[PDB]
Design a protein around this ligand. Structure first.
Ligand code: TA1
Ligand code: GTP
Ligand code: GDP
Ligand code: MG
Lengths: 146, 432, 440
């Protein structure tokens, strides 16, 4: 999934003009509703899915980088272990989540030659990054204190 | 130029808007037919903020009326100012919401929202440089909450840059008129906290208290409450329309008021108030207005500001007055009640002054306060919400219209998080 | 020919410009419509002086000024006011909303789209000039437009014209009274352009002038009009040497030669000595010694800072009216004798003196009395820092929690740009604490 400007967009799902809603399960916490969750059985499948996702990502050029990113990106892998000793053990014992996050780089505006739509994208990116910095500092202070 | 678009939804919003239009028109001098009959030349200088031209030297307000019951539309048309509005802007349906948030938000409102949005696009396209929107509605009701929230969401989606305001009447603590107020109020606040840019919290109990204690009326009706609210609404946006020594756009108020994005709930106030037959005793001046303005009895939010701290505050004066007196009075108020002001904002009073006072008021002042004590209001609703959600008192009416318990749970959690944020600053100490 | 260009930015600048141009039109005998009937009665002279007014074919005089703002109200008061026929119709309004006390809006998003028109108008005015001497920019810290657009305009002017002088008059935030909760952010951000590109910046505070009006002039409820009239008197006294004859004359280059010992120390204070009501105008001689002693009184400073806590590094005195050099020499000797006024060891001379014959004028409906002698002092002291220190404290108290920062970030500003400016400010203050240490 990608976060472009406070909207979640799916990448493996083909061209879909609509956005995806964010809802909080009372027990499992935040999540995104109707994310195209795809299974895999061969390395070729995940490789092709990764290629398609990188292709469909929104990317624009600027003075700092010919191919910069205009959106935060999140890659998630859900992995299940099934122990099937029929005499003793049970299946679906362990479920694990692996998350890999690529964040957009802070924009300095005047140094990047941003203008028009690029400037608004930079502003939204900076707002998100500042919020991230505030939580990080707060959470660090909180765990350090207690 | 700064054009505002005005929307009204539900019985409460429509009646408030009718009274408000009957006021602004006098301030600018417009006859009920539409023609202009005034005396000063400043009245037409900025009339385009609210009104559009029409060929016969006529003025039509830039308003939109919304409901799902023809009764309120009929009442508004069959009235003193019914002929001032454009007929095409009367959008309505039949088989109203019936005090059900689900019917307003999902089932019935979803049909009429497209027509309402078409009218809104047509009205906004003609504006030269649109400033923002404003919408009047009641949270405890049906039609108002659902359709207002849906329209706010859609308009924010389409016009992300402009300002959105709201003058919402919240459920009162004790004077109640609907049995399922908490569900609608919670579900509405869950979206208001996210989408809009400012919100002014009105409560009927506070208005009745002002009417009976200050104005000394004997049989207040909803007309007087609409009067007070209209006075405040007109006073907030004066600096767009008349010249002054210190202007204050809506965006400037937004920047100076809210310190963080989620804390955009305000308590409004207006001064003076002599109750008549006692105007000859009170000497009207700047310190008298400041004394009446910061008093607790005057507040319209039905919440005591002494139980928290003022995150910040803004005062808009209208009259011909000296700047030193204003600055000295605001400094004195800040220094005297030093406990009730947050300590990590060195100066937390925004000031504006305009030269043209109301028709017959040598002076006037409007007050917009942002204080932690507002959390009390939300807590009340939350408590009542739990008392009816633990046993699912009236839930099936909502679930029959396409909802689920998860929606209620996330709304309750979001409002509780709001209460926790406001409570984070309320206590003293904190400091550096 | 001696010529200057005035730029007024923001509401404060425009109002100060109204008061200023009222005074200038009164001084040279120009009616509000631009006509000058006295030429028909006098029959000669260049009394329609080129320092501020340009003369067309039909005898009309048009001032050399540029007004700028991002909202239409304040200038629309002038487009339909008493002076509607004086100015050129090109007044450069932005037909949109205002910066809303946001530096980023006034420097990045909304501040542009009107900068090019301003530069074109200034180009036309400078090209029409012949011997341009300097720019006089009026603005105010704490406002979105007056900070951001002033920064952008000053940067462009420094890039474009380069070697011309650029003075600056500004309304600095007061220690206690204020009218906005985000003033410190705007002032600290504005520090860069006034530090790097400006050539000499004068500071003014509202609290100081309120006190002066209360005590000297006996006005209990003053408004902004009195403030602007006093500032206009100061600016006129500064610029008078370019216009009228005098025994000792001082150009703008003289100010920039005698008041700035080093490039980064160009922030002097200004005072005007004979401020007195008509009722108290009697009972007092108002001689040269009295008015020049009144300048050093700490209570008459135009900024709420105590000069006694620092050291005087330079002083310019500008006299108007019936003044003789013997008296000013005696006054300078007397001031040098006193001990409360401390001069740095590396400036044995200290004083520069200028004298002009034209006495100050009186506006109808004013508050200042008619006087025969007037003085304006421009003093470069090390007390200023103190005021800066106070403002810095406020900034820190709001930046520890990142309050109001998202408004700035959402309009193109980056967060780190805050911190840099603060550090820059700290650097200037330290260089105003070493330039005064006694030599060893
Ligand atoms: C005769 C006189 O001047 O007496 C005052 C008066 O006694 C007081 C009590 C008035 C009076 O207001 C009320 O009694 C009242 C009743 C219900 C709800 C709200 C108010 C007054 O009715 C209200 C009236 O206010 C106005 O006319 C304003 O110009 C105001 N009017 C409207 O809101 C309005 C309503 C319908 C149609 C057109 C205008 C206004 C403000 C901004 C822009 C335009 C108009 C005034 C000064 C007075 C009376 C008549 C007693 C007050 O109201 C206003 C808005 O001024 C109440 O607090 C103020 C203080 C005044 O001293
Ligand atoms: N001396 C003096 N100061 C003024 C006057 N008017 C406003 N100010 C000062 O200006 C500050 C407010 O910022 P402004 O100068 O008004 O900024 P602005 O020109 O309105 O720019 P925007 O905020 O974008 O509209 C206040 O702190 C006032 O003290 C004036 O007439 N005289
Ligand atoms: N201030 C004010 N409140 C009103 C008025 N009319 C109704 N109300 C309040 O509105 C609430 C009911 O909301 P309602 O208008 O029925 O919502 P709707 O059915 O969706 O339009 C009640 O709690 C009333 O107190 C009015 O004229 N003025
Ligand atoms: Mg302004």
């Amino acid at each position: 999934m990608e976060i472009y400007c406070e909207r979640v967009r799916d990448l493996l799902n083909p061209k879909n003009k609509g956005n995806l809603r964010v809802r909080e399960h009372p027990l499992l916490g935040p999540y995104v509703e109707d994310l195209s969750k795809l299974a895999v059985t061969s390395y070729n499948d995940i490789q092709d899915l990764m290629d398609s996702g990188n292709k469909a990502r929104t990317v624009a050029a600027t003075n700092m980088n010919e191919t910069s990113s205009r959106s935060h990106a999140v890659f998630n892998i859900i992995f299940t272990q099934k122990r099937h000793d029929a005499e003793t053990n049970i299946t679906t014992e362990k479920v694990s989540k692996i998350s890999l996050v690529d964040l957009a780089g802070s924009e300095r505006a005047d140094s990047t030659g941003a203008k028009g739509t690029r400037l608004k994208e930079g502003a939204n990116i900076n707002k998100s990054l500042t919020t991230l910095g505030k939580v990080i500092s707060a959470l660090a202070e909180m765990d350090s204190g207690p | 130029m700064r054009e505002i678009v005005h929307i009204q939804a539900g019985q409460c919003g429509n009646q408030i808007g009718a009274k408000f239009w009957e006021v602004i028109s006098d301030e600018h001098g417009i006859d009920p037919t539409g023609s202009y009959h005034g005396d000063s030349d400043l009245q037409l200088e900025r009339i385009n903020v609210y009104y559009n031209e029409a060929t016969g030297n006529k003025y039509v307000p830039r308003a939109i009326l919304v409901d799902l019951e023809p009764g309120t539309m009929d009442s508004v048309r069959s009235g003193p100012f019914g002929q001032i509005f454009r007929p095409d802007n009367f959008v309505f349906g039949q088989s109203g919401a019936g005090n059900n948030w689900a019917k307003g938000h999902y089932t019935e409102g979803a049909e009429l929202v497209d027509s309402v949005l078409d009218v809104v696009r047509k009205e906004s396209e003609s504006c030269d440089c649109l400033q923002g929107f404003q919408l009047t509605h009641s949270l405890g009701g049906g039609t108002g909450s659902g359709m207002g929230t849906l329209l706010i969401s859609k308009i924010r989606e389409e016009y992300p840059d402009r300002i959105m305001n709201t003058f919402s009447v919240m459920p009162s603590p004790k004077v109640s008129d609907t049995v399922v107020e908490p569900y609608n109020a919670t579900l509405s606040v869950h979206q208001l906290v996210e989408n809009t840019d400012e919100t002014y919290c009105i409560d009927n109990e506070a208005l009745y208290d002002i009417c009976f204690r200050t104005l000394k009326l004997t049989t207040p009706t909803y007309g007087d409450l609409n009067h007070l609210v209209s006075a405040t609404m007109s006073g907030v946006t004066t600096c767009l329309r008349f010249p002054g020594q210190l202007n204050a756009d809506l965006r400037k108020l937004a920047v100076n008021m809210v310190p963080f994005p989620r804390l955009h709930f305000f308590m409004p106030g207006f001064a003076p108030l002599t109750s008549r037959g006692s105007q000859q005793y009170r000497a009207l001046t700047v310190p008298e207005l400041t004394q009446q303005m910061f008093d607790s009895k005057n507040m319209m939010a039905a919440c005591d500001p002494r139980h928290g701290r003022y995150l910040t505050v803004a005062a808009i004066f209208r009259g011909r007055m000296s700047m030193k007196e204003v600055d000295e009075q605001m400094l004195n108020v800040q220094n005297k009640n030093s406990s009730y002001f947050v300590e990590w904002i060195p100066n937390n009073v925004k000031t504006a002054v305009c030269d043209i006072p109301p028709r017959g008021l040598k002076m006037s002042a409007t007050f917009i306060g942002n204080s932690t004590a507002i959390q009390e209001l939300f807590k009340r609703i939350s408590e009542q919400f739990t008392a009816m959600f633990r046993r699912k008192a009236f839930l099936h009416w909502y679930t029959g219209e396409g909802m689920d318990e998860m929606e209620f749970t996330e709304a309750e959690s979001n409002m509780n998080d709001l209460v926790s944020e406001y409570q984070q600053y309320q206590d003293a100490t904190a400091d550096e | 020919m001696r010529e200057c260009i005035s730029i007024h930015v923001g509401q404060a600048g425009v109002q100060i410009g109204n008061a200023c141009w009222e005074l200038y039109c009164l001084e040279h005998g120009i009616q509000p419509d631009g006509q000058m009937p006295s030429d028909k009665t006098i029959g000669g002279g260049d009394d329609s002086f080129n320092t501020f007014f340009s003369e067309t074919g039909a005898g009309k005089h048009v001032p050399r000024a540029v007004f700028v703002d991002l909202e239409p109200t304040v200038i629309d008061e002038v487009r339909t006011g008493t002076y509607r026929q004086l100015f050129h119709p090109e007044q450069l309004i932005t037909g949109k909303e205002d910066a809303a006390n946001n530096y980023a809006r006034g420097h990045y998003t909304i501040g542009k789209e009107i900068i090019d028109l301003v530069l074109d108008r200034i180009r036309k005015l400078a090209d029409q000039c012949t011997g341009l001497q300097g720019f006089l920019v009026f603005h105010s810290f704490g406002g979105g437009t007056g900070s951001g657009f002033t920064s952008l305009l000053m940067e462009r002017l420094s890039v474009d014209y380069g070697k011309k002088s650029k003075l600056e008059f500004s309304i600095y935030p007061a220690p206690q009274v204020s009218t906005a909760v985000v003033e410190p952010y705007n002032s600290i951000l504005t520090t860069h352009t006034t530090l790097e590109h400006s050539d000499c910046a004068f500071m003014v505070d509202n609290e100081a002038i309120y006190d002066i009006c209360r005590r000297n002039l006996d006005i209990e409820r003053p408004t902004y009009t009195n403030l602007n009239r006093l500032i206009s008197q100061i600016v006129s006294s500064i610029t008078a040497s370019l216009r009228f004859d005098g025994a000792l004359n001082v150009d703008l280059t003289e100010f920039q030669t005698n008041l700035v010992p080093y490039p980064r120390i160009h922030f002097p204070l200004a005072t005007y000595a004979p401020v007195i009501s008509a009722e108290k105008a009697y009972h007092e001689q108002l001689s040269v010694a009295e008015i020049t002693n009144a300048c050093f009184e700490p209570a008459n400073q135009m900024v709420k800072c105590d000069p006694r806590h620092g050291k005087y590094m330079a002083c310019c005195l500008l006299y108007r009216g019936d003044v003789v050099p013997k008296d000013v020499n005696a006054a300078i000797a007397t001031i040098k004798t006193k001990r409360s006024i401390q001069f740095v060891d590396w400036c044995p001379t200290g004083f520069k003196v200028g004298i002009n014959y034209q006495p100050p004028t009186v506006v109808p409906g004013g508050d200042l009395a008619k006087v025969q002698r007037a003085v304006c002092m421009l003093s470069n002291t090390t007390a200023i820092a103190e005021a800066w220190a106070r403002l810095d404290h406020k900034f820190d108290l709001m930046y520890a929690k990142r309050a109001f920062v998202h408004w700035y970030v959402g309009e193109g500003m980056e967060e780190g740009e805050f911190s840099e400016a603060r550090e820059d400010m700290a650097a200037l203050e330290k260089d105003y604490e070493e330039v005064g240490v006694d030599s060893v």
